[PDB]
Amino acid sequence: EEVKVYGMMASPFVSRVEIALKLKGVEYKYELEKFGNFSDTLIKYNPVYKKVPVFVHNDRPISESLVILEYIDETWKQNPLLPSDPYKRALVRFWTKFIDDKCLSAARKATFSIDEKEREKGIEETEEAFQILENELKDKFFGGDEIGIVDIAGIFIAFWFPIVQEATRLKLFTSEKFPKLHKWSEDLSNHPIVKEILPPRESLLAYF
Amino acid sequence: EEVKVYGMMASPFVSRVEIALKLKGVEYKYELEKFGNFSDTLIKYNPVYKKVPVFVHNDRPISESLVILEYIDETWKQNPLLPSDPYKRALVRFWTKFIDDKCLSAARKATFSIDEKEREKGIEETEEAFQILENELKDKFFGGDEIGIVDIAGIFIAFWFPIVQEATRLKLFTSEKFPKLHKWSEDLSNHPIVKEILPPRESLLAYFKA
């Protein structure tokens, strides 16, 4: 009967839950939370981290985002996210690990300045440590022809990353340096439902 | 026929695979690795992370350690390691995730010095944020009646951490502070399996004091 999400206006983690949940064809109340100090009924549901996205249904919570994704894929078996073969499903998880390791690309092209920035290099390796292994324009994108988990796990690349370099004024991400997955970023655009769960394009530019 | 693990002589992660791999009643050839710079036929199997344990069988590698445990459960299903219900299957993975999310806590107050030591205090919260929520002297240890996945993910507590403090001369870990899980630490001693892939304790004690 009941299915309840806890999250903010623009967390890429709260996004990765909603998309997965929305492809499933599942309804969901959405209750917002404060950027700073949160509510109590959520901190009761994640007293450990006190972090969104927290996902509950019939009052039973599931904290942390990458574990939520793997819950919903084997509860509603409409539009599978994860591969069906135990080995390629094992490979697929190895990449969501890597996408989570890669996220440290955001923590260096966003929240730094001056010299403490260019004590960096990793992002350029990851994008190559990407493309050159995954293949998302020789055939479709990641997990089969439609949206897989690795796609959703990397939406802070497909959408949020293009919109952040306008805090470093950087042009790392372009069809001259990383062509194979710049056209993959199109993941942002398509899907007449994913097509919102993502906020407006120009509004976010203001925030950075 | 063939099944291969690649790793070092006493990595807590390489232990974490082998026990899991052992419970199922599965053989495994074992190839050792260089403390410093590694071989090529391993980095051909793990060009991305370049850290053991790398696990292969029928030439098909699986790098990264917590995913290997979940691989062995799904083709070799005798005494299942993961829960059957999608919720507790989510929690048990939610718990491996926390144990591994914390892990820089164990490596904080152990192999560091001066200020960066007592700049930790997370260990004492997590160790309480362990037993104050686990409550597994109520029944067995973690996941069900036999060894469950959450246990193996936290073997760097059950074995290494007890050893590892007598380099900073710390006494954080005692049965007086964490009784539900100090008595759990005897997961190592009990159980005819965790026993043997775990090296000697007194040999290991020598390594850290150096």
Numbering used by the authors:
A (entry chain B): 6 to 213
B (entry chain A): 6 to 215
Paper text:
GSTs are multifunctional enzymes that have evolved from a thioredoxin-like ancestor gene. GSTs catalyze the nucleophilic attack of reduced GSH (γ-Glu–Cys–Gly) on the electrophilic center of these compounds, leading to the formation of GSH conjugates that display higher solubility and reduced toxicity. Each subunit displays two ligand-binding sites: a G-site and an H-site. In the present work, DNA shuffling was employed for the design and creation of a library of tau class GSTs (GSTUs) from abiotic stress-treated Phaseolus vulgaris and Glycine max.
The enzyme that resulted from DNA shuffling, which was denoted as PvGmGSTUG in accordance with the nomenclature proposed by Edwards et al. (2000), clustered together with the tau class GSTs. PvGmGSTUG was crystallized with two molecules in the crystallographic asymmetric unit that followed the typical dimer formation found in other GSTs. Residues 1–5 in both chains, and the fragments 214–224 (chain B), and 216–224 (chain A) were not included in the structure owing to high disorder. The analysis revealed that each monomer of PvGmGSTUG consists of two distinct domains: at the N-terminal region a small α/β thioredoxin-like domain with βαβαββα folding topology is formed. At the C-terminal region a large helical domain is formed. In PvGmGSTUG, a Phe residue replaces Lys, a change that could affect the orientation of GSH. In PvGmGSTUG, it is replaced by a Cys residue, a change that could make the H-site more open and possibly alter its binding properties. A fourth hydrophobic residue, Leu134, is replaced by Ala134 in PvGmGSTUG, a change that may contribute to weakening of the interface. Structural examination revealed that the key residue bridging the dimer interface, Asp105, may play an important role in inter-subunit communication.
